[model samples]
Target: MGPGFDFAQAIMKKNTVIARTEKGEFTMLGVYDRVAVIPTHASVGEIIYINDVETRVLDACALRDLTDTNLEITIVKLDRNQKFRDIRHFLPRCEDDYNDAVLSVHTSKFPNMYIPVGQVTNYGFLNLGGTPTHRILMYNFPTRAGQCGGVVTTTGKVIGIHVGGNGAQGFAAMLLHSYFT
Candidate 1:
């Protein structure tokens, strides 16, 4: 396996986790990342599960410099105080402009599935049942129902978080690192 493959494998090890809210279930992206970034709506989850391990949220920061793409990323902190010093070393340039392929965690569809999203399709604002104020970067990735809140990684580094889907089109919150604290 090459670096891309290795990156994908590494994401599966720490980033993917099953989250549950009072309404229902969803996925939390970058659970192990020091400053966890997830869709704003995903912040409802009080508990997150990785494999059989469980953790509680210590805090949640809603609406962290939400992009015009309607991708409102919320910062989540777990109860554990352990720090990931290397987490900052992995921040990907969110404005790469050119992303060939991306890795996605379709937690609500198939558990733990790190599927590869296709090349870039479009980049602009498109409403997904929300106000059309923000903008998002669209891709030719095929996403399933209730698949938002998952992480989107290009070249093993996170480029964004899946916000919503339109038929076969997938939209995500690009330029995400700037909002984190």
Candidate 2:
């Protein structure tokens, strides 16, 4: 069995949602009632579909620097009739530590799937531009393209979001409850 099997199942069925944009479909993590997060680069302002329910991008984190640490996330507002409960349990805390068994849940290039069972290799900064800035988590898994914005969990607790990978190593931005504040 994989790490956080029960947690993964629940997230895939409930907390995980697909964002439908004019460009394409992306993964989103439901963290609060009528609220979810997606890659900042995804569509915003236009009417979008979340798991088939209509929605729009309500907000996004500011780019602190030209780095992956810019929190590459956008807030989504689900329809008034839609409801997502108990998803706050997936929010990461500052006290939480990386574990040996970590998993990423996504529906990129396939149905909802968990892959490349890996571990957080280090907590560091990303230099997407020319200088290091912000913080990022490095892992040993080879994550796929559409996996961005997916949740990374250890022992049923989300610690970060998958951002990018190089087929040999992966990068994730640590998610914090304060991001929603």
Candidate 3:
């Protein structure tokens, strides 16, 4: 036989149980610390710039801010089974939380998603954190309703949620966190 790897093979192998609640689907980017520098103070024309493969992020943001008093993230991720059973995307109607981040639940075709964990969420980190990035990104589009939940992640992990968009243009999409709340 040939190699068992097929390009069309599904990436996720989790036994997904369709949830009755809503789903969160976002498309974002993973950015790295790319910088150019010289070995010595006077390395003429010998400057070095480090570049890496762009990491993708969810097209969402933090539903809340650094304060718990006025925090309200609007989006959340849902189970994969639920997404496989919907038609129209069940987006949150309206909300009043200005600083709240949006939610999205989707998959990626790349490797690690390099999100600014401390930048977007209210996470107090060791080095870079305690503020909001304000910009977000998204890649894969939603296909059905009940397909959204957490912003940072569908499983809701830490240290990989980016906040901002292309050249820091504007805010990303919005979500109804209550769908799974």
Candidate 4:
């Protein structure tokens, strides 16, 4: 491991962890890079919601996103654009709220990771003491029970996280590097 050769790894056991490449097969992400995840520290996060009603998602695997709104949480050590990676979104959609929205990037963005926070924006809680990374197009969408606390895949690579579904149309998610550190 030299200054020029970067490496990285991810370990999300009960929590998602993204690590810098450490002489392994995995590639390298710089200190400026980051990962996020939605927090599932509640009951609603697990139980499915239907048309504003609480229920269980029968065919869990069939659950999907609720729309084409999505974005990437940049990984910055000192502040700079890294690159486009993989993505994933976790939201449990119940019967009433049947049609899981289409998860896709913005007009010019090609997003890989999808975190359905469901229209809720509760950032600034993570005072973990790290440099801030600007988001190019952090378009958040909805998250149901099925998508809570899951892995967000990007570029065929696990990037951020999916925490839980909010009472309404919002859900909380933590980037892969946030809790995975």
- Number of the top-ranking candidate, with lDDT as the measure: 2
Q: Which stretches in model 4 have alpha-carbon errors above 4 Å? A: 1-122, 126-139, 167-169, 175-181
Cα shift from native, residue 78, model 1 (Å): 1.6
- Candidate-wise lDDT, in order: 0.61, 0.66, 0.24, 0.26
lDDT of 3 by residue, 1-181 (tens): 1111110011112211111211222232111111111101111121111122222222222344344321223222321122232211223333322322223333432222222211232222111123342213243223232222223322222112222233332123233333232
lDDT of 2: 0.66
Off-target runs (Cα >4 Å) in candidate 2 are 58-69, 95-97, 129-133
Compute each candidate's TM-score over C-alphas.
0.75, 0.80, 0.22, 0.24
RMSD of 2: 3.2
By summed lDDT, the worst window of 10 consecutive residues in model 3 runs over 34-43
Preferred candidate (TM-score higher): 3 or 4: 4
Residue 134 accuracy (lDDT) in model 4: 19
Off-target runs (Cα >4 Å) in candidate 3 are: 1-109, 121-164
Tell me the lDDT of model 1 at 144.
71
Model 1 whole-model lDDT (C-alpha atoms): 0.61
Clashes in each model (backbone N, CA, C under 3 Å)? 7, 0, 42, 59
- The residue-level lDDT of candidate 3 at 66 comes to 42
Q: Give the Å error, residue 174, model 4.
A: 3.0
